[PDB]
Amino acid sequence: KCVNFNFNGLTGTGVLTSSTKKFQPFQQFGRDVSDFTDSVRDPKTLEILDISPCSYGGVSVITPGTNTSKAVAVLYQDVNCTDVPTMLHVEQVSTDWRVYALSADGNMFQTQAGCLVGATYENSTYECDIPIGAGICAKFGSIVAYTMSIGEDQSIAYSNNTIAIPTNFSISVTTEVLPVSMTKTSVDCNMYICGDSTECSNLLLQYGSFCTQLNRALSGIAVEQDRNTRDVFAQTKAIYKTPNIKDFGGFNFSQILPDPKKPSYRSPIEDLLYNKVTLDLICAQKFNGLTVLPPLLTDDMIAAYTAALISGTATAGYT
């Protein structure tokens, strides 16, 4: 049972069991490499006991989201489903927990990761949603566990006297997204640590350049972020005027080039991108010495670069 204990003044909390270890004639307790006591000699009965942490190995709770249901499943890591009622402490403390710790028909499923309780098993394959273990995932549609699929099955028969050749084709366009830069921050290392305390300030000066080093590291990052942007967009120095013609032999560029007759300096697609990733604490940050610095290049300048790159491609080679 999980319990508090005291042996000759040696206290702690844990589970006391029978040991198979041996002690020296005058040894009262044993400890492992972490100086954790795992064995004690009982002062009245000359018998060595074993001491275990009340809970150990890790437990995970699986949820579909509290805005969907209040159903959960519990994964007991690296245990069998026959030992759950023992690793738990069902008869000692658990109340509503008893329904998860105790087995029942269709209540427990044994996996490699551990024992999963509260979820059923589909006996089918699907794309992974919530990963649980190795090869096992689950979905809401209670909770359903299943083996994840790695793709559909295909079979190409081998032959040595035939060949397949396409008689038709299509043009497709795909989208790839890459991060280029971070938000540039700056910290006032005195305002953050001491604030208005002048006594603290005098004591903070006793830590040498530690404070200065922090400022230097952040400054270096801030500079790099402007280099990151420049090294991606500023590929050609020449800036090409966006043409009034968006029809280049039947090819329509009006969605990737900016429209000079509109209030906007960005293309239709770009405007859509901007409105999708846009997504007082600010006062608290400022008062405690935390601020944010603007980028060297404005959004209109970045747009100018992309417009030039496209305009100079639709009209010329060796760009």
Partner 1 sequence: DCSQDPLSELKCTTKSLTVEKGIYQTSNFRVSPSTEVVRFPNITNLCPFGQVFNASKFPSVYAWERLRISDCVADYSVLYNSSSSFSTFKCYGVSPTKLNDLCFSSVYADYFVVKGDDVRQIAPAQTGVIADYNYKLPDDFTGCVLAW
Partner 2 sequence: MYICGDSTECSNLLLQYGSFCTQLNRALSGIAVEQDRNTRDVFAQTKAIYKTPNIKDFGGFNFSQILPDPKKPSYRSPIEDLLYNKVTLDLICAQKFNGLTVLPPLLTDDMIAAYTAALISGTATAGYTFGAGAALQIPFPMQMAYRFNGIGVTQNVLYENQKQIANQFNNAISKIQDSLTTTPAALGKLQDVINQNAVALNTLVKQLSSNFGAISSVLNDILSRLDPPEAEVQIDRLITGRLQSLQTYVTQQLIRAAEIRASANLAATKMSECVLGQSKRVDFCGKGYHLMSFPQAAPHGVVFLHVTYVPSQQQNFTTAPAICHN
Partner 3 sequence: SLTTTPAALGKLQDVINQNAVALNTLVKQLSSNFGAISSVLNDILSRLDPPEAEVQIDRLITGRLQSLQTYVTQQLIRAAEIRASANLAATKMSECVLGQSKRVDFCGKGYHLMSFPQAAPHGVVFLHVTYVPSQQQNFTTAPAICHNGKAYFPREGVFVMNGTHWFITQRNFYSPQVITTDNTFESGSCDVVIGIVNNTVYDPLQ
Ligand X SMILES: *[C@@H]1O[C@H](CO)[C@@H](O[C@@H]2O[C@H](CO)[C@@H](O)[C@H](O)[C@H]2NC(C)=O)[C@H](O)[C@H]1NC(C)=O
Provide the greatest CA pair distance for the chain. 100
Residue 168 interacts with ligand X (CB under 6 A)? Answer: yes
58: exposed, middle or buried (C-beta count within 10 Å: 0-12, 13-18, 19+)? exposed
- Smaller CB distance to partner 3: residue 90 or 293? 293
Q: Do the Cβ atoms of 5 and 57 come closer than 8 Å? A: no
Residue 57 interacts with partner 1 (CB under 8 A)? Answer: no
Compute how many residues bind ligand NAG; rule: CB under 6 A: 7
Planar angle of CA 215, 220, 222, nearest 5 degrees: 95
Q: What one-letter code names the amino acid at 37?
A: T
Residue 252 interacts with ligand X (CB under 6 A)? Answer: yes
Residue 177 interacts with partner 2 (CB under 8 A)? Answer: no
Q: Cα–Cα distance between 158 and 294 in angstroms, integer?
A: 61
Taking phi over 0 as left and psi of -120 to 50 as alpha, with beta for the rest, 89 belongs to left
Which x/- pattern over 13-52 shows residues binding ligand X (rule: CB under 6 A)? -------------------------------x--------
Q: Cα–Cα distance between 29 and 10 in angstroms, integer?
A: 9
In the list ligand X, partner 3, partner 2, none, the entry touching 297 (Cβ below 5 to 8 angstroms by class) is none
Q: What one-letter code names the amino acid at 166?
A: P
- Smaller CB distance to partner 1: residue 68 or 162? 68
Task: By CB under 8 A, name the one of 150, 203, 239, 245 that touches partner 3.
Answer: 203
Task: By CB under 8 A, name the one of 45, 95, 162, 206 that touches partner 2.
Answer: 162
Cβ neighbours of residue 193 closer than 8 Å, sequence gap 6 or more: 200, 204, 211
Q: What one-letter code names the amino acid at 229?
A: T
Cβ 207 to partner 2 shortest distance, Å: 16
Task: By CB under 6 A, name the one of 80, 255, 291, 319 that touches ligand X.
Answer: 255
Task: By CB under 8 A, name the one of 180, 239, 245, 296 that touches partner 3.
Answer: 180
- The residues that touch ligand NAG, with contacts defined as CB under 6 A, are 67, 78-80, 83, 123, 162
- The residues that touch ligand X, with contacts defined as CB under 6 A, are 44, 160-161, 168, 247, 252, 254-255
